[PDB]
Amino acid sequence: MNTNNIKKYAPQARNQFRDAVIQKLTTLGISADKKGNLQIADAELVGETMRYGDYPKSTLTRRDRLVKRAREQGFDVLVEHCAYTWFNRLCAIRYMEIHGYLDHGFHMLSHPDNPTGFEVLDHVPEVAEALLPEKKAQLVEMKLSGNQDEAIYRELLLAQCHALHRAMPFLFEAVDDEAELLLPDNLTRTDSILRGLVDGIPEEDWQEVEVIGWLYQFYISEKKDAVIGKVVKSEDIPAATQLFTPNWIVQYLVQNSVGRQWLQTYPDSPLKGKMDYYIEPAEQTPEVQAQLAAITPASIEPESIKVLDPACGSGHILIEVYNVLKNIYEERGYRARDIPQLILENNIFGLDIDDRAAQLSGFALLMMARQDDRRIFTRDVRLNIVSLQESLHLDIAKLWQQLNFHQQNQLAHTDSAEYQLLMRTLKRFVNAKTLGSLIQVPQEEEAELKAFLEALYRMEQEGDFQQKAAAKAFIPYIQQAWILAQRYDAVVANPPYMGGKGMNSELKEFAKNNFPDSKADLFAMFMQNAFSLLKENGFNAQVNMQSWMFLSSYEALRNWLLDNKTFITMAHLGARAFGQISGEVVQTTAWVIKNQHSERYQPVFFRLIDGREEVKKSDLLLRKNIFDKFTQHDFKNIPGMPIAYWIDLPSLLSFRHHKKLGEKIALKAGMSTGDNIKFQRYWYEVSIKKTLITNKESNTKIDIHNIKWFPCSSGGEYRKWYGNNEIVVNWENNGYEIRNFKFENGKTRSAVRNDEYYFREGITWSKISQGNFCVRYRPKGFVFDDTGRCGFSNNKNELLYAAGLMCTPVVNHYLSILAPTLSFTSGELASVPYPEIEDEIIELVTNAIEIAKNDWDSQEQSWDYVCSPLLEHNSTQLLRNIYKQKINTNIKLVETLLLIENTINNIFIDKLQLDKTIIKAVLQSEITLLCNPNYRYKNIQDHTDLTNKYYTDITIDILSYIIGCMMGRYSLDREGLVYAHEGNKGFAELVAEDAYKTFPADNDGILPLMDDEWFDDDVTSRVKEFVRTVWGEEHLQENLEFIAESLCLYAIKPKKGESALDTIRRYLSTQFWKDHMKMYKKRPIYWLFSSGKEKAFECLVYLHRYNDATLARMRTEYVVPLLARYQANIDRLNEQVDGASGGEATRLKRERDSLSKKFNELRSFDDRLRHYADMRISIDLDDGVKVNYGKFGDLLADVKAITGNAPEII
Amino acid sequence: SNMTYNNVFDHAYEMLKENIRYDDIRDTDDLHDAIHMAADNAVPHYYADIFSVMASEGIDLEFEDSGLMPDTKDVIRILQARIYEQLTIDLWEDAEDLLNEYLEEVEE
Amino acid sequence: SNMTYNNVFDHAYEMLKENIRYDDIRDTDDLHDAIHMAADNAVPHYYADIFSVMASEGIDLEFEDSGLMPDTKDVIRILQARIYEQLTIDLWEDAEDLLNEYLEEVEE
Ligand SMILES: C[S@@+](CC[C@H](N)C(=O)[O-])C[C@H]1O[C@@H](n2cnc3c(N)ncnc32)[C@H](O)[C@@H]1O
């Protein structure tokens, strides 16, 4: 079947039918404002003609039963229902003329031998003879005028629907006067809505019945995507939760539920022969085997079994229950023609809130029974597939005396049990359109409700005009209530999926008051409520989202399940199970849970989480990937009690025998500052004197009054032993800013938690970690927030012993059981095993931590940074031979940590009595060191391109240090960080202390980053001065030529004959700013001022070394002296273009041209630096770098890449 | 030296999932920054890689908004700008989805 | 979809050999046009090819002269401009060689 014709048509057919009902309402006098507000206009009385906007007068009482319904229901609500219901009434006629189910047998909507005609037009008398016998001579005289074909086609189609009111009353009503008025006109035009129904759906698509389900799903498809994300209105629920389950899941469900009970009583029932999805009860213990046979009845009558889908939708599930009862009656020996009546009446019951999902459902089931019994259409066939109804609109007192039940008129009897039972039930269904089949009814009221429902049926046919219309309104409620009061042998359904942030105000409080253990999603509420609708030995079998199996928000429930109910069989599907959904928003699982408790019971599991829907259907029929080795009492041993069938044995038995990790290490969640952009900074954004970082060069006491920024373990990326020490927070006056930080109304905004554990030694991990899990060492002087949870012990050995564990794959083996997500919170991780303290691990961890501290501290982003790792070897060796020396060193360090990590893993594996096949050891590409090229470069797989990439970052790391030396941030004479605090204070006191006597620190802090040597304190000039100063004038050229080789590898592209020095100056003025952006995470400490995009003047400025008069000096001794050079050289270049001819005069022109555009830019950059320099702007380093970078408008570079906001020009 | 834009959008998309969680962004009126940074941090750095991204599907060579285009002699910045803009546009098209996904991720 | 700049300079270089012969250019004071056209006619037209040229040796991504750079939202024009400029610069570096080669090619 080509659903594409359907999928394209049904959503458009929804809107065709709606707009066709809206233009029939405008004449009916019913409309709404642009937003939605009803309107009427009494009605004009022209003798016996009512002109509303033009209609007979007898169509006025049937018009004012529609003005009724709108006031209480809504304009956008009635269109959607009535365009759905007529679209339903027609698709059922379209379906019944193709299967020739009409007694008159002529095509009713199309013409077999005419793609554009209608066959009932040609046989007007035949079609009328069957339907309108007395109106033939009048219909015969119309088609004999030849011009009223639209008026004739309408008289018949309605005469067909009144005819269908007897056997299918849920869809075709008779004195449904209100309906017949919304039937559109223009049914015989080339643009009638009808043509699309014949032309948009090939007749092949109409053969099977599931088409009903595809119509069902696709029709409502469009309104779904709008009602998502928001809260779903009570009227939009069916849209936001309507799917269509693959047939092979419904078969598993109905056959492992309905067929199971008939099998448990008559074991050799051949029924098993059809069910291919029937799972075989695992070898049960002969005790439970003996328990189950003492409960099963010795005999079940086929017509005593009673099944219930509380949310059928397309009835898609009921069709299967109908199929499996069909082979119970075929196996029991009942006449083929006698089966449909006995199933639909005795066995199948259905419910739903979508009045129209019940219309289609009952048709799909009646098209099932007509495919087997041609005369079912003649019998009085009551269907137990009703939609739930509200009761905020009933004329209660008019109907109880229109009933005349006790026959009082030839409120009497308010102490009679027919009034007391009547009023008790109308209150349970106050908000039924919103509560659905979740409103419970006691089984004690079954008999009373049923006995009164059949009496209401009685007086619907034996009463007069008053008792008949009256009881006809009452039955919808008493029936659905009796359905709910009845207890069933099995309840199957694909319940609706809707989270609490789509649930509405009425549904939330009902969830809190009736379903505490499963208030989360609707599918849990259905799973729990279905148990209260089952006989003792009844079965519950749904298909649900999988989260109820692992989330600790359901532990209350998973414990309720494991103790009172019994797991029979589950099929764990996972993602992409449904093949008409996009987005990883869906993962699923199916199951069957008996309503009896059997502790020792052994359930069978099927791990079908891989492949597309097609893959799992194959593997299920083929019984692949089975787990039948763990009872529901074994899942009680895993904390939280997660269904975790996929477990092994030794991992299950390690839980009963050891103490929990939490019992020994205090896992503590950090604070929540309330504002990460206000209170958190990178430790280099602010002063080093204003941070609680114990520097190696400040023996002057750390005034704990002056300290404003404290390092904060803020999670970060994957890292195994020490790193991620980058984030400092504002904890001045013990958090006087964060504690008192309230909202604008007074409700406190920040969440200072565990403020007692601050400044302590402990371990830290990334609470939010996409991949594996790992902790780190965290020395004294740290605070921590919520993104970086930290665990503390007092015993430093237990702290280290836990550290080495919490980085092993052994822990990521346990964290996959307790909860498969990305959240490594404090609940699941506390229940991890934790064996006795072995002392061999405590030393392997300390070797590990210091290797990972040494790797981290090797970067200029770590406060424990010392100096460039190149400065550790002999300065006489060639520099290109020193690179080879450091690559061979960094690879040995990786094997040292890898052998330390694997020995920690395999040791933990032996103590916990685990299996080494399951826990894979640590590979090389998993060592969390920055000197490990297989982890730092996950992208490049190659070897020559993986080598050159590493060569480039090392080249950059040593370049950012020579510039750091130039700015005064580091020194060859003094180890570690040197100058780094606000306003260039104290820099001069260090020059008189010979703090930089080896390599001089630049004069003003303005390093001209230009593409030609104009100044002597120019960056490139000083880099050459740096290599000559370190590795010798002897190797200056071999060392410098080698820096151009490594830069042109990946960083930039080569040029022919571009000298090694011009190669380094080119990287600097083009690519270095990029790499320093990347290197400090857009929070640079060397800011790049730019004249423009000619690069007429660019210079680096150390953030810390900035004061009011900095822009002044940049203009005095640079922007001014350079413009008198440009002029003195542009007049000397205009002497030279003239004196050249041939090819050389051309060569000199292009050089006067590139230099003149730099004189106008620097003239337009000076008038803007004359504006911001007269301002004497002074910065507060505490404000962060995002904030200060926008104060300067467009004097800086990438102001929007950094600040996010464009540069405010002036 | 290959690298696809779809690869790059995936990093950017993941950057923004983190950025929303690290700042507790709730309404779109405060989502702008988290989207801009996620894009900028995902742009490739090498000339070989940046060209590779352009040559791929999901990104064209005509900008939308001149202001985001550096009037500049540095074409790697330009091609680098064009990838920023494309990433931001696509990210906003999933903004309500994520704000819904992150709002709908606690349920507590 | 590969194409090297050295491939492109070869077409441009050959364009200029023809251009000098078809107009009888003798002094460099009249060579400017023939060089500009030869470069423009050699720029690739497809996005796939133009990126391929950039990624190759002999051409960088920073212009020399803003005027030749279309201040434009159309980056294929820009990358297309950058290849024009590089071609013209290289061609002038062989101008006297060709003017000598074409002057020295008749000998009659
Ligand atoms: C079961 S699904 C629809 C798809 C269906 N599985 C099928 O096979 O066609 C959800 C349906 O039941 C409705 N619903 C919501 N809450 C309900 C409740 N408490 N009882 C019954 N139906 C409910 C939804 O609005 C929707 O119409």
Author numbering:
A (entry chain A): 1 to 53, 56 to 412, 426 to 1225
B (entry chain B), C (entry chain B): 3 to 110
Give the text the authors published on this PDB structure.
Bacteriophage Exclusion (BREX) systems recognise and methylate 6 bp non-palindromic motifs within the host genome, and prevent replication of non-methylated phage DNA that encodes these same motifs. The PglX N-terminal domain encodes the methyltransferase, whereas the C-terminal domain is for motif recognition. Our data demonstrate that PglX is used to recognise specific DNA sequences for BREX activity, contributing to motif recognition for both phage defence and host methylation. As a result, the PglX structure, and lack of nuclease motifs and potential aligned catalytic residues, supports PglX acting as a methyltransferase only, and not acting as a restriction enzyme.
Ocr is the T7-encoded restriction system inhibitor that blocks phage defence activity of the E. coli BREX system. Within the asymmetric unit, PglX-SAM binds to a protomer of Ocr as a 1:1 complex, with the single protomer of Ocr binding along the positively charged region of the C-terminal domain of PglX. In this complex, the Ocr protomers perfectly align and abut one another, forming the equivalent of a solution state dimer, and the size matches our analytical SEC. We therefore concluded that this heterotetrameric form represented the solution state of the PglX-SAM:Ocr complex. Six salt bridges are produced between R79, D35, D42, D62, D76 and E109 of Ocr and D1213, K1201, K1097, K1070, K1110, and K516 of PglX, respectively. The complex is stabilised by a number of hydrogen bonds between Ocr and the C-terminal domain of PglX. Also visible in the PglX-SAM:Ocr structure is a bound SAM molecule, in the same ligand binding position as seen in the PglX-SAM structure. The PglX molecules from the PglX-SAM and PglX-SAM:Ocr structures align closely with an RMSD of 1.34 Å (9564 atoms), suggesting that binding of Ocr does not elicit any substantive domain movement. Within PglX, there were again two regions of the sequence which could not be modelled due to insufficient density (residues 54–55 and 413–420). Collectively, these data suggest that Ocr acts as a DNA mimic, capable of sequestering PglX and therefore blocking BREX activity by preventing recognition of target DNA.
